[PDB]
Design a protein around this nucleic acid. Sequence first.
RNA 1: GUUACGGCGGUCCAUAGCGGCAGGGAAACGCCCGGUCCCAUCCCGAACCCGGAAGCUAAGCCUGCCAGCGCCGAUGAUACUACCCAUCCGGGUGGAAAAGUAGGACACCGCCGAACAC
Lengths: 182, 75, 192, 136, 126, 79
Amino acid sequence: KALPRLKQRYREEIREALQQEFNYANVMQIPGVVKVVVNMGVGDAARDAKLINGAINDLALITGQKPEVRRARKSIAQFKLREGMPIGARVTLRGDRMWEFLDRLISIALPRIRDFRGLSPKQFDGTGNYTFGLNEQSMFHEIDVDSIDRPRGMDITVVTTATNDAEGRALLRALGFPFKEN
Amino acid sequence: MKPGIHPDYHPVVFQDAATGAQFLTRSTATSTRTIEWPTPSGPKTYPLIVVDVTSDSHPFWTGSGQVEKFRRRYG
Amino acid sequence: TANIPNKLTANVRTRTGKGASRQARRDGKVPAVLYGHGTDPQHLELNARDFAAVLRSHGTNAILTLDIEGTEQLALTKALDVHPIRRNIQHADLLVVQRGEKVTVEVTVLVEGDATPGTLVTQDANTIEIEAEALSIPEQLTVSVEGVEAGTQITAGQISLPEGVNLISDPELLVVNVVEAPSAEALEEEGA
Amino acid sequence: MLIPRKVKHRKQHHPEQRGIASGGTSVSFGDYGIQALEHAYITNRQIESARIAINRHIKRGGKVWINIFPDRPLTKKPAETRMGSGKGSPEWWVANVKPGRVLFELSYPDEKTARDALTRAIHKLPIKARIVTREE
Amino acid sequence: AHKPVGQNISEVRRNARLRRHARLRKKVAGTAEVPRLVVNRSARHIHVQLVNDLNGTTLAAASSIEADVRAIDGDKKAHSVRVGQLIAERAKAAGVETVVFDRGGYTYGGRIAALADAAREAGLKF
Amino acid sequence: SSSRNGRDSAAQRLGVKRFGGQVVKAGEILVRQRGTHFHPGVNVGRGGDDTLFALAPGAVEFGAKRGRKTVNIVPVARP
RNA sequence: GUUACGGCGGUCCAUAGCGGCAGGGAAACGCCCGGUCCCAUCCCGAACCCGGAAGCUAAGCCUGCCAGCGCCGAUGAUACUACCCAUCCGGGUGGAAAAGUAGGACACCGCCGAACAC
């Protein structure tokens, strides 16, 4: 007994508009976002093993779920990197929590970037999966932006059952990502 | 989701402090990260969060040398 | 293409084995095999002088009008089995042929070439794969190289054909490469 | 000079000199070739001598292919040493050459000069050999 | 001229099931006096067999499709329970008391486990 | 002036020991081997060192089971 | 018995695979709706698990087509070889490859269950 904003919108308008654009036979062919992905590469694992915990705490406060700590399966010593050194955190988002996260991101933070002209239409890949990146976490009001001791940027990537970049960009437009309309 | 608890999950009302085009919806943002004023926008009552800036208050895609001047300025 | 399919007396074999075959080669015959969609593999002995006359005359792929057991038959030479040193002909496969069939073939080009002075030719390939009719296989794909200059990669899809003959080797091939000609000082820096 | 840049095993048995050729019994890339008749081990220096013999007999332009490469070493051991006490070090590199095999291929227009050149390169080698045209 | 990209989870789930079922099958055996109890599940209904892997033959059978088993009203679990009852009766008619239990590439628990536990209760030795 | 080579390891007597057709008792050793060149089939068991042995008497059949050479044992006919 | 059905298996395991084309959804195989209950994520009801049948055969799957990517593959000859003859060379009786060729092949078989029927 509840509905998020973007999901109600998705089931109302966007499916209709893509149908009226691309004319699929079955509606099962309709594109739909599955999951959302978050990652943070600490990179100074061999110099600060504590920024890892810092990033864990930030993403906790940001996404409302305890992250995963991705280990280094290979040992490349030109970076000090050794088998099992924690280099980064990672979180998966699916469902109502995902739609809420996109609502927050599109409505609070991305309208808080400094001189946001536009996210490119060219972060796609093969079929329409949008892989962008943030330099700082100085933007989410979710975050306690008084306590941060360093910039700890991140990298986001958005995956969809779309089959090509045209359908991907069209769907993400209907959903309200500020592309550079070109 | 599972024990080894995550942050807590409660609703939120993001009150548009720009032009009054507010938002309100379930979230994982709560004791964790919420503001006072439990304002019911709906059949129930739940926390509120002043929204210093947003979309409809952030000019962008979704929101809104010269020689002919030189010798305009230089007469 | 008014071919005269050469005629040859062939007799079926009594004994099929290495000893018999060597005795045959020694006597002055050549063993041979016949098959196809005949689906009755016949084992023959031809006569080597006559066979060599036939080949030297009409190229290697050269239809035959055989005489087996008094009965006559029609065949094509699909494959030869040659010795390296002596350069005899040890054995010969023969594909039966009805008239009007499409069988794939592999013939030889002929570089009729007189070039510019600053020019040299390089024949990257001799053999090109073709489908044609039974009685209508060529002997020599004549390719002409005159008036041309340095690099002119004669592709395979540039040769002139008969009417009703098709190229089946890919048209990517360098049949010829017209190299910029060497220097007497370039001949010192090749293979050292 | 011809040598490999590295071999995995730098002390090998002596190659065999038994049997006839399986490949290289057919001229490939030129017009006028050389064909062996015997069994022999042909080294680096021989082939250098031969290619130089050919290039100093055509002298301008016309190409030479070497279908052989000395990729099998042999081991001398230092002088006046009683037998035993190991296996000597590689010093010169051979290619085995079975009868029927083709070594060289020329591409020069006139058969006169070409046949003569190949003969001068034959007289720089330990084997009886003969000259080949690409024809049947 | 619309065209897809790759694997659907139906294919994934299917071939993973076959993968782990023929993993498990290494240890399970078959015989006419100790046959294998295979189960083949779907979301809606369920099927089971008694198998002799010496000849790849079959001795019993049951499923939740038969109207007499649909005459249950209760949960999926209760359908499964009555199925276990029927197969116990049928097996012990055709002359099999002891068996093994192949979970067929599925996890133990829920409908599978309630089936098997009903069968253990109603007499089969496993 | 030394040959630093010269070592070697004594044998282990590996390979097949009971070929096709023969009569074998129980617990008898068909093959000794390092890896599972030959795998078990029916009425056959594996060891620690990937040796094979018989679990039931009978006679041999080196057959394949999905590309892998197996070893089996079949019932002798009782006299 | 039977159809473009499902499931469990087998072949000394690609003759069975990959890719392209068309085509099917009665009961079933499915995908899908949602996390109330068992149960679960090194975070995520994504997976596993649970409760149902709004929707679609789009995909999976099954059916036919394409010998194209791969595979299979002979006869005969050759290499090699056992034995014997033979003053070096070479040869005879028997055995017999690899490659290549002709070709084959868009699998076959068994059991139970359904649906269908006398």
